[PDB]
């Protein structure tokens, strides 16, 4: 919950 990617997603 900050724009991550497909595997690391926050």
DSSP conformation letters of 1-10 = --S--SSS--
Question: How many other C-beta atoms are found inside a 10 Å radius of the C-beta of residue 7?
Answer: 5
CB 2 within 8 A of CB 10: yes
Distance from C-alpha of 8 to C-alpha of 2, rounded to nearest angstrom? 11
Q: 7 is written with which tokens?
A: 């595997």
Distance from C-alpha of 10 to C-alpha of 2, rounded to nearest angstrom? 6
Name the experimental technique. Answer: NMR
Q: Where are the alpha helices (DSSP H) in 1-10?
A: none
């Amino acid at each position: 919950x900050x724009f991550x990617n497909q595997y690391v997603a926050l």
